Write a protein that binds this ligand. Sequence first.
Ligand code: CL
Length: 234
Amino acid sequence: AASRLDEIMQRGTLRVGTTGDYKPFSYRDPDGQFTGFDIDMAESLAKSLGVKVEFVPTTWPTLMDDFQADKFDIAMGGVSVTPERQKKADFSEPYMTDGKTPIVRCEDADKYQTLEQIDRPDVRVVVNPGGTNERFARAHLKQAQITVYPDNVTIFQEIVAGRADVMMTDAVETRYQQKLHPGLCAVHVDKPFTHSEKAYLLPRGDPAFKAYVDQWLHQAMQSGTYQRIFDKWL
Ligand SMILES: [Cl-]
């Protein structure tokens, strides 16, 4: 019945679900430390509340089930607002805009500027399984050969090696991957095919907790805190 704010204050810690697999938002290094834009934002929210932060590992396939099992109070780590997630959770106000856009071999940058160019019988589109990327590919590709590749790290090497031609993912991810792989280039990264918003996942039916988060976030956007963290990571 009581707000999660009460439980957080009594416990003395804010439990933050995060995947640790999405630079620059959230990454868990071998030593077990989390770093990234949303790790720093989580520390700022916890500081506002006067509590310690505890990072709770989750994964994209288990995010919602873990949240419903009360494994954490809020999820922070490059999470897009989606209608599917809104059935089971609320969201904070958004903290940045994103969208899906291609990443290709640099020599192919001009070949794959539009979906009409990509959606052709001989184009080999690769995608990671089970999430918003595969949903996007299957909703927008009627002719291209879609291959699902299971390894979320080595998938980009499929394009480098010439086993695939295009992958469409979050524009922020294409920025990171085109720096990591010199042979790949993000396609019109400032004008993605879709418009999405990143936000923090919150429990339904707790307007007080959501209002606290929204107020902290609005203050951070105008105080210099957001600017500093954004400049460090994005
Ligand atoms: Cl995905």
